Amino acid sequence: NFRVYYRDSRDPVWKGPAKLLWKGEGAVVIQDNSDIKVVPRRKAKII
Amino acid sequence: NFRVYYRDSRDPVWKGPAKLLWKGEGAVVIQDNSDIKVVPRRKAKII
Amino acid sequence: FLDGIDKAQEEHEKYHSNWRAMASDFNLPPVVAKEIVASCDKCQLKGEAMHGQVDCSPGIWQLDCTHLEGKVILVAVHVASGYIEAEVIPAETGQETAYFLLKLAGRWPVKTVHTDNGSNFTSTTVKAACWWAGIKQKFAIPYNPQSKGVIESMNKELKKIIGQVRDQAEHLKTAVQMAVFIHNFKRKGGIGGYSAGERIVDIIATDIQTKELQKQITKIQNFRVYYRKGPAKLLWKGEGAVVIQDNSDIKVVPRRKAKII
Amino acid sequence: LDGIDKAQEEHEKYHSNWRAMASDFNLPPVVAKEIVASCDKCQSPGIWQLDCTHLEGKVILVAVHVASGYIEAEVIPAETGQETAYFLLKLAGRWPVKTVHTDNGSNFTSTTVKAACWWAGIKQKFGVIESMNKELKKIIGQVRDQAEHLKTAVQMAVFIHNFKRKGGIGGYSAGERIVDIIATDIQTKELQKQITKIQNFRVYYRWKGPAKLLWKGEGAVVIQDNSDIKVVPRRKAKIIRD
Amino acid sequence: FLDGIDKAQEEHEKYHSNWRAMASDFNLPPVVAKEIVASCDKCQLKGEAMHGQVDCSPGIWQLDCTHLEGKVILVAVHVASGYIEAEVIPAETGQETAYFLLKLAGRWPVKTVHTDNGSNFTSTTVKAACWWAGIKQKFAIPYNPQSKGVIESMNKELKKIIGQVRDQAEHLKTAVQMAVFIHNFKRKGGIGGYSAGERIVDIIATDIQTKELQKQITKIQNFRVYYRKGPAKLLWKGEGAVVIQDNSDIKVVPRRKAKII
Amino acid sequence: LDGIDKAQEEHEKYHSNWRAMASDFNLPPVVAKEIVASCDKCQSPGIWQLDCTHLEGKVILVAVHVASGYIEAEVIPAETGQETAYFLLKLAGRWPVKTVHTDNGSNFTSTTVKAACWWAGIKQKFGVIESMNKELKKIIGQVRDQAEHLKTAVQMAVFIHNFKRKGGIGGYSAGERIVDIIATDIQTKELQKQITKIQNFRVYYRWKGPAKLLWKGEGAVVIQDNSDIKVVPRRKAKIIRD
Amino acid sequence: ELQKQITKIQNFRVYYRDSRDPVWKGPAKLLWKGEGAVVIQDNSDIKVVPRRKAKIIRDYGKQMAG
Amino acid sequence: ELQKQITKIQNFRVYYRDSRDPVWKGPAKLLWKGEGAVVIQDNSDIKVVPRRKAKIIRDYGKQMAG
DNA sequence: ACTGCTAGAGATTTTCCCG
DNA sequence: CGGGAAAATCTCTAGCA
DNA sequence: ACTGCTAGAGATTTTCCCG
DNA sequence: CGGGAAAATCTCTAGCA
Numbered sequence A, B: 001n002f003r004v005y006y007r008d009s010r011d012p013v014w015k016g017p018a019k020l021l022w023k024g025e026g027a028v029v030i031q032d033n034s035d036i037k038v039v040p041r042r043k044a045k046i047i
Numbered sequence C, E: 001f002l003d004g005i006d007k008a009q010e011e012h013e014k015y016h017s018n019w020r021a022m023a024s025d026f027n028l029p030p031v032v033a034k035e036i037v038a039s040c041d042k043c044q045l046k047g048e049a050m051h052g053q054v055d056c057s058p059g060i061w062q063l064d065c066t067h068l069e070g071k072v073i074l075v076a077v078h079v080a081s082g083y084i085e086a087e088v089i090p091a092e093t094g095q096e097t098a099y100f101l102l103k104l105a106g107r108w109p110v111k112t113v114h115t116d117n118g119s120n121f122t123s124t125t126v127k128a129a130c131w132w133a134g135i136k137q138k139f140a141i142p143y144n145p146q147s148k149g150v151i152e153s154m155n156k157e158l159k160k161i162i163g164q165v166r167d168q169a170e171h172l173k174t175a176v177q178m179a180v181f182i183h184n185f186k187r188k189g190g191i192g193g194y195s196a197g198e199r200i201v202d203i204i205a206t207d208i209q210t211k212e213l214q215k216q217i218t219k220i221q222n223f224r225v226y227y228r229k230g231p232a233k234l235l236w237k238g239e240g241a242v243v244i245q246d247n248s249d250i251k252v253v254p255r256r257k258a259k260i261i
Numbered sequence D, F: 001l002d003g004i005d006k007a008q009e010e011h012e013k014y015h016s017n018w019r020a021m022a023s024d025f026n027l028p029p030v031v032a033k034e035i036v037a038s039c040d041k042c043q044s045p046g047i048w049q050l051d052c053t054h055l056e057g058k059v060i061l062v063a064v065h066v067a068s069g070y071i072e073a074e075v076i077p078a079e080t081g082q083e084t085a086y087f088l089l090k091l092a093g094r095w096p097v098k099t100v101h102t103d104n105g106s107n108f109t110s111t112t113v114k115a116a117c118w119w120a121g122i123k124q125k126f127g128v129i130e131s132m133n134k135e136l137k138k139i140i141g142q143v144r145d146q147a148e149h150l151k152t153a154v155q156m157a158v159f160i161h162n163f164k165r166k167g168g169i170g171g172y173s174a175g176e177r178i179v180d181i182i183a184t185d186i187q188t189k190e191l192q193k194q195i196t197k198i199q200n201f202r203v204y205y206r207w208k209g210p211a212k213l214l215w216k217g218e219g220a221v222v223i224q225d226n227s228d229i230k231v232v233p234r235r236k237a238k239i240i241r242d
Numbered sequence G, H: 001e002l003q004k005q006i007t008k009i010q011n012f013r014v015y016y017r018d019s020r021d022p023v024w025k026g027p028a029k030l031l032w033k034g035e036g037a038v039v040i041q042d043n044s045d046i047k048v049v050p051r052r053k054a055k056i057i058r059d060y061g062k063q064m065a066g
Numbered sequence I, K: 001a002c003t004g005c006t007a008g009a010g011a012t013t014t015t016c017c018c019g
Numbered sequence J, L: 001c002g003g004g005a006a007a008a009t010c011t012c013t014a015g016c017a
């Protein structure tokens, strides 16, 4: 399992940790409190 | 002699040609209609 | 390190020091200090320093709206070639976008469009137009313009050309069409030293020709290859190497340890 | 290189074009063109034709690519020179348009259309359009019920004609045909460009009389002297400009 | 090329085609097409793709104002080390900036400041403060933040640290001081694996020590070197190479073809 | 390496510190410290002292670096714990401050100052300040006419004291002295860090009894066994952790 | 029959990119074209590239030069 | 006398940059320090660097490690 | 006549360590 | 010398109005 | 489950050209 | 093979809200 810390929508703040559902090249799909988000990998950190 | 085409102050337009008075590393000093300006070399082209 | 580790954890809870500082100030291995930092949610404030790569398939089009002189210009770009289409429209409406897209699909082989999540692109009218034209819709990640970087760059380029020819036209629509013409046929570069129009013609013709050629070849060439495994279909062979497709997994193998029937 | 003699023999026996012989005998297209054009016994993509039609009180401006049957049709507010000039500038920006055929109508002969053609480098000259208009009207009648407005139906008909109607020698569509024809036109223009570059050179080989230059590639230098094509190595030849 | 050149010039006057397009479409040498483009004022719309480098002398300070939570933070950075000073001020006033700068000059050896052209930095009060403190003023090119990139980056960094510790302080000034402390002594990296405070102490002490050492050496070592020329003063010698200063022009020469008296 | 024997002889004859012997005989500082600390016969930078003074009805808070004479003085709105805590947090962020000496005043003993010290890791303990205050007041009197407000005069006096007043053994200023002292403190901390890293190792050489590790450099491995420092090559030694 | 078609397919040039490289690699020679993958040869190196990272042309300037 | 001071000066490390390179070059050995120029030696290569492009330290972590 | 940088997340190359 | 793990160096990006 | 790019200004390396 | 000029390739940046 992984912890993802991200930055979704024009919010300079960073959120997380979220469950990493999917990882691609340049983007990830995560779940943060029953809300699935798609975040570019530029705006995400996976641990 | 050189022709300088530049971009000075928040104006997206490009001006010139101007007389190149001085050239340094990263900046140039030019004269455009008796008005001396200092322009970063990122915003200037010398011919 | 138990004492040093516990001291470093309190020091980080106060100051959020980086792993280098705690390693230097508590005699910690870099792994342990990195673990201390990595377990603090307040320090996870940076993403990985890379970039993705947009789709460049031959049927890929990127659409966007730009604004010039108080008017709206709807711009499409063919990603493979850089060939652009642009039209000045009265408003950023769904019907206007659907009409533009129907025209584009009727003039060129458009298989999918990549747009951001502006209200016009997400309208039901554009969805119906795409359904009728057989176009798939790929929406970018919200507030991520880089996802459509090509069209974004083209926006800049298009505007630049307009700025060069604005005096030659009295309306903005005529200058927009002049800029489209200039970009498509008067600017040369890129992979083939081409213009955008030459490159798009080459891309589309190459797609058709390669499809037909490979169809004929697979019709004639029919073999099964074993390697190291099951009867993988033969794809290509020669020069001591054989490319095969085993269970929809294309792989390259040396000619040694391979048999063709 | 080695296949020039076979290529000339094949041309004498069948009078084939340069593309077939260049494909068959692995010759550069310049040499094949030269041996095709050296026999006196062996001796369109940019032309569009436009017209304005009427349906349901709306004037539809239609341009046809004559070589392929490709159509660009749109509903214009009025049969006016300004709309025609805008349509033609758009078409010139979308496709390589060189000559346009019209019917001496009031719009097509206007000063605005002439100015647009002058800017876009299009030549103006004053039966395919009638058949194409009939087919377009038939398709519009077929797909009228699927659209509320006429412009959308027109665009749907253009889509169907250009990509969903297949026929002819190879069973292709109009879009496929136009892409093929423009690709051939690009090849022809590139070959002409190269001939223009190499026609200003003179080669002295083995020294013998001045000869024209055909190819300067990886293997050797192919020239033509006294209506006879020869191949010589670099050090046995001298290429100059006159 | 006269005919092709004249045709290309008219084609460019209409379309502003790039040199590649005109070379391809009029059979022109790349030099001639590049000359055609280079003589059109309407096509000069791009500068050279480089960057400068800010001054990094030991007496160099970069000052700026940033805004957080509706308050103004005046920030100085020592460019050589990255050591920062910051203070929350009631307003972006010239007297406030002059007071900040007098404090900085009284606490550290400040020889010149590099600021943008904001109204406070260009005030007469700051000029008088710099004159009294013996500080030279270097103003950046207007609307060019990159000229003070260091402090700009520090701004971001400072704000980041504030965002990490904002809950530990009730006022913003206390959180600003906490961030300054953390940056100066709790973050390690850079050239010496240092903190900013350690690095600034090292830089200043090294400057003093090297100055005194070189003064003593030049007091003892006294020679004139001829090479290839006049009596250049000897600066350094050894390993088959001699560095000399001839007419205020420091140059390196091999030990061969050089005589020392 | 080769100079350990000479270094021990020099230390026995003069009882010199490790810095002088490490400079003279080109030894790593760890070995010099070891031979300095192996003889029983041979056996400040972070302390600041603060006080509030008064001038022209304004309370000036002054901190002095005891080792160097460096001063940080500023005019505070009121002699209150909050201003003292803000001043001390600033000073801790500007310099390495470890211990602070105060005079049991109402502000210095407040909970806000204690909390600030706890956050900044400063220890609180309850004659240099009187002389320093006298000198600061003298300088302020000298430069009062050059400033309208008292805070500016205070800062000008701080500037003059820290950089424009030169005296002492070497004729330095207070800023030079404080930078030198903090640089020495950084060196001392680094040496202690390295000793802490290498004190947990045990070396078996030539195998003989366990020995402590001193240096593992480019040449060989320097260890200490039975109060006698030896040098052995790598393959003749084994370094483990206990 | 088959050999002529094979050579015709190898006459096509491919410009491709890798997963983490933003620079388009030079004109490799096309060997096989699939629905989602393309098999190319780049300087005696056989690679398999996703279709989304491949631009397949012919380069008409060059076909007509040899 | 002079030799001790010379070695002491060479004990200082210099991090420098060139005119068009944005990357700081590694810790060269200091040979001479002037008002506006610094003479350094970087891997058997003697260079002259402007003072505005040179950070001269001592690296105390390393002086105290040998 | 002045001038992008900085610090962190990965990726790749160097170096130390024992046989 | 052979790997292998740890350290070091290189690459690259957002945010700084 | 998605994804920075593009075109121009210099700089540096490759290639063609004649001896 | 030796330079030398021309071509080609590589590097890097602003602007795209």
Ligand SMILES: Nc1c(C(=O)NCc2ccc(F)cc2F)c(=O)n(O)c2ncc(CCCCCCO)cc12
Residues within 6 Å of the ligand: E064, E065, E116, E117, E118, E119, E142, E143, E145, E146, E149, E152, E153, I004, J016, J017
């Ligand atoms: N735009 C300002 C920025 C700014 O864009 N930053 C972002 C930013 C962007 C790129 C970069 F590489 C570094 C950066 F930081 C900034 O940082 N500061 O500080 C500023 N300060 C003052 C004024 C207005 C000056 C008053 C008019 C003077 C005319 O002469 C503008 C700015």
Ligand SMILES: Nc1c(C(=O)NCc2ccc(F)cc2F)c(=O)n(O)c2ncc(CCCCCCO)cc12
Residues within 6 Å of the ligand: C064, C065, C116, C117, C118, C119, C142, C143, C145, C146, C149, C152, C153, K004, L016, L017
């Ligand atoms: N910010 C927009 C930009 C934009 O910042 N460009 C600059 C830009 C910056 C970086 C880059 F790499 C490429 C770029 F181009 C842009 O270009 N376009 O087109 C936009 N279009 C629509 C909306 C708002 C969508 C409505 C809300 C949807 C929420 O789901 C915003 C934008």
Ligand SMILES: [Mg+2]
Residues within 6 Å of the ligand: C064, C065, C116, C118
């Ligand atoms: Mg958009």
Ligand SMILES: [Mg+2]
Residues within 6 Å of the ligand: C064, C065, C145, C151, C152, C155
């Ligand atoms: Mg956009």
Ligand SMILES: [Mg+2]
Residues within 6 Å of the ligand: E064, E065, E116, E118
């Ligand atoms: Mg500013």
Ligand SMILES: [Mg+2]
Residues within 6 Å of the ligand: E064, E065, E145, E151, E152, E155
């Ligand atoms: Mg700023």
Ligand SMILES: [Zn+2]
Residues within 6 Å of the ligand: C012, C016, C017, C037, C040, C041, C042, C043
């Ligand atoms: Zn933390």
Ligand SMILES: [Zn+2]
Residues within 6 Å of the ligand: E012, E016, E017, E037, E040, E041, E042, E043
């Ligand atoms: Zn132009």
